[PDB]
mmCIF file of C-alpha atoms in Angstrom:
data_model
loop_
_atom_site.group_PDB
_atom_site.id
_atom_site.type_symbol
_atom_site.label_atom_id
_atom_site.label_comp_id
_atom_site.label_asym_id
_atom_site.label_seq_id
_atom_site.Cartn_x
_atom_site.Cartn_y
_atom_site.Cartn_z
ATOM 1 C CA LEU O 59 29.764 -7.954 -23.159
ATOM 2 C CA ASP O 60 28.903 -10.030 -20.386
ATOM 3 C CA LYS O 61 29.723 -8.237 -17.547
ATOM 4 C CA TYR O 62 27.046 -5.966 -18.697
ATOM 5 C CA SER O 63 24.829 -8.792 -20.448
ATOM 6 C CA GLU O 64 25.235 -10.298 -16.714
ATOM 7 C CA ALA O 65 24.394 -7.275 -15.539
ATOM 8 C CA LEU O 66 21.205 -6.565 -17.493
ATOM 9 C CA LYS O 67 20.409 -9.911 -17.055
ATOM 10 C CA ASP O 68 20.411 -8.902 -13.161
ATOM 11 C CA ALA O 69 18.877 -5.166 -13.419
ATOM 12 C CA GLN O 70 16.305 -6.400 -15.577
ATOM 13 C CA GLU O 71 15.460 -9.188 -13.806
ATOM 14 C CA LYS O 72 15.540 -7.231 -10.840
ATOM 15 C CA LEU O 73 12.691 -4.598 -12.813
ATOM 16 C CA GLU O 74 10.804 -7.244 -13.718
ATOM 17 C CA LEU O 75 11.074 -8.149 -9.924
ATOM 18 C CA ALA O 76 10.855 -4.055 -9.023
ATOM 19 C CA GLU O 77 8.437 -3.932 -11.014
ATOM 20 C CA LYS O 78 6.302 -7.085 -9.742
ATOM 21 C CA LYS O 79 7.234 -5.791 -6.488
ATOM 22 C CA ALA O 80 5.757 -1.631 -7.779
ATOM 23 C CA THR O 81 3.011 -3.410 -9.279
ATOM 24 C CA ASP O 82 2.006 -5.943 -5.908
ATOM 25 C CA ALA O 83 3.067 -2.343 -4.094
ATOM 26 C CA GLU O 84 0.502 -0.815 -6.678
ATOM 27 C CA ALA O 85 -2.045 -4.099 -5.399
ATOM 28 C CA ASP O 86 -1.010 -3.669 -2.401
ATOM 29 C CA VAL O 87 -1.650 0.218 -2.725
ATOM 30 C CA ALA O 88 -5.077 -0.306 -5.018
ATOM 31 C CA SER O 89 -6.273 -3.317 -2.112
ATOM 32 C CA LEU O 90 -5.668 -1.010 1.332
ATOM 33 C CA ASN O 91 -6.371 2.027 -0.590
ATOM 34 C CA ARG O 92 -10.338 -0.676 -0.971
ATOM 35 C CA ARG O 93 -9.520 -1.287 2.672
ATOM 36 C CA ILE O 94 -8.884 1.731 4.428
ATOM 37 C CA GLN O 95 -11.335 3.089 2.299
ATOM 38 C CA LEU O 96 -13.593 -0.082 3.844
ATOM 39 C CA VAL O 97 -11.896 1.109 7.410
ATOM 40 C CA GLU O 98 -12.728 4.744 6.899
ATOM 41 C CA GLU O 99 -16.379 3.774 5.894
ATOM 42 C CA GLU O 100 -17.246 0.983 8.259
ATOM 43 C CA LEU O 101 -15.567 3.566 11.453
ATOM 44 C CA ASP O 102 -17.715 5.829 9.939
ATOM 45 C CA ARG O 103 -20.567 3.297 10.284
ATOM 46 C CA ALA O 104 -18.989 3.135 14.209
ATOM 47 C CA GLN O 105 -19.527 6.758 14.474
ATOM 48 C CA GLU O 106 -23.092 6.573 13.061
ATOM 49 C CA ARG O 107 -23.941 3.881 15.561
ATOM 50 C CA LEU O 108 -22.033 5.169 18.236
ATOM 51 C CA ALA O 109 -23.222 8.679 18.442
ATOM 52 C CA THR O 110 -27.338 6.715 17.464
ATOM 53 C CA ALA O 111 -25.932 4.504 20.637
ATOM 54 C CA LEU O 112 -25.278 7.676 22.652
ATOM 55 C CA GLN O 113 -28.327 9.477 21.305
ATOM 56 C CA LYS O 114 -30.386 6.005 22.095
ATOM 57 C CA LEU O 115 -28.027 6.151 25.398
ATOM 58 C CA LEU Y 59 28.905 -2.662 -25.212
ATOM 59 C CA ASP Y 60 26.644 -0.018 -26.450
ATOM 60 C CA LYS Y 61 23.889 -2.289 -27.182
ATOM 61 C CA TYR Y 62 23.687 -4.361 -22.554
ATOM 62 C CA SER Y 63 25.954 -0.881 -21.651
ATOM 63 C CA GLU Y 64 22.297 0.308 -22.396
ATOM 64 C CA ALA Y 65 20.038 -2.338 -22.344
ATOM 65 C CA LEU Y 66 21.447 -2.079 -18.822
ATOM 66 C CA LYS Y 67 21.830 1.436 -17.693
ATOM 67 C CA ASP Y 68 17.747 1.568 -19.221
ATOM 68 C CA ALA Y 69 17.313 -1.629 -17.563
ATOM 69 C CA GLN Y 70 18.773 0.111 -14.223
ATOM 70 C CA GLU Y 71 17.360 3.981 -14.931
ATOM 71 C CA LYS Y 72 13.378 1.679 -15.343
ATOM 72 C CA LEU Y 73 14.888 -0.185 -11.836
ATOM 73 C CA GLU Y 74 15.007 2.290 -10.359
ATOM 74 C CA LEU Y 75 12.128 3.239 -12.019
ATOM 75 C CA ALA Y 76 10.472 0.258 -11.139
ATOM 76 C CA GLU Y 77 11.725 0.808 -7.250
ATOM 77 C CA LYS Y 78 10.263 4.137 -7.097
ATOM 78 C CA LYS Y 79 6.652 3.452 -8.519
ATOM 79 C CA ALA Y 80 7.808 0.553 -5.765
ATOM 80 C CA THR Y 81 8.654 3.635 -3.291
ATOM 81 C CA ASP Y 82 6.241 5.055 -3.934
ATOM 82 C CA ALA Y 83 4.159 2.998 -4.212
ATOM 83 C CA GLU Y 84 4.897 1.598 -0.944
ATOM 84 C CA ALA Y 85 5.101 4.121 0.574
ATOM 85 C CA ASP Y 86 1.503 5.597 -0.314
ATOM 86 C CA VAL Y 87 0.711 1.545 0.406
ATOM 87 C CA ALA Y 88 2.119 2.392 3.637
ATOM 88 C CA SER Y 89 0.230 5.660 3.828
ATOM 89 C CA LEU Y 90 -2.323 4.082 3.646
ATOM 90 C CA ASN Y 91 -1.272 0.901 6.092
ATOM 91 C CA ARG Y 92 -0.819 3.803 9.220
ATOM 92 C CA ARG Y 93 -4.141 4.361 7.628
ATOM 93 C CA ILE Y 94 -5.838 1.665 8.135
ATOM 94 C CA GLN Y 95 -4.062 0.986 11.394
ATOM 95 C CA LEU Y 96 -5.277 4.259 12.769
ATOM 96 C CA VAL Y 97 -8.938 4.232 11.377
ATOM 97 C CA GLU Y 98 -9.178 0.191 11.858
ATOM 98 C CA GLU Y 99 -8.637 1.044 15.430
ATOM 99 C CA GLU Y 100 -10.349 4.086 15.321
ATOM 100 C CA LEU Y 101 -13.095 1.400 13.819
ATOM 101 C CA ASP Y 102 -12.420 -0.782 16.682
ATOM 102 C CA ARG Y 103 -11.990 2.354 18.923
ATOM 103 C CA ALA Y 104 -15.323 3.165 17.342
ATOM 104 C CA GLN Y 105 -17.067 0.266 17.214
ATOM 105 C CA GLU Y 106 -15.729 -0.202 21.554
ATOM 106 C CA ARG Y 107 -16.967 2.033 22.647
ATOM 107 C CA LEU Y 108 -20.124 1.195 20.324
ATOM 108 C CA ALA Y 109 -20.362 -1.673 21.871
ATOM 109 C CA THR Y 110 -19.585 0.586 25.322
ATOM 110 C CA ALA Y 111 -22.734 3.002 24.954
ATOM 111 C CA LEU Y 112 -24.483 -0.276 23.061
ATOM 112 C CA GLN Y 113 -23.494 -1.710 26.574
ATOM 113 C CA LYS Y 114 -24.875 1.363 28.038
ATOM 114 C CA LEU Y 115 -27.697 1.330 26.394
#
């Protein structure tokens, strides 16, 4: 009962931590998706500014 | 024993799933991290190309 209870408190805590890791990994997926998109948008802007600088050049 | 064994297999399944929520979220953030590294590297290369175009300008 304890082997399972212990395995459970550990599986359950590991779950809360895996769920937390998932929460954080997902928070990071979302925070990075935001950041990736921000760098993609800023990249498009750098590329547009580059096309502009190159046309001005 | 069954209550703990079941709660355990469920904590373990939830754990494997949460680990996969995290692994998939990790795969996604990792994909995104690769994208931020590549896009941000291009942001900076575009920004550097831009700085170059602007300096040349």
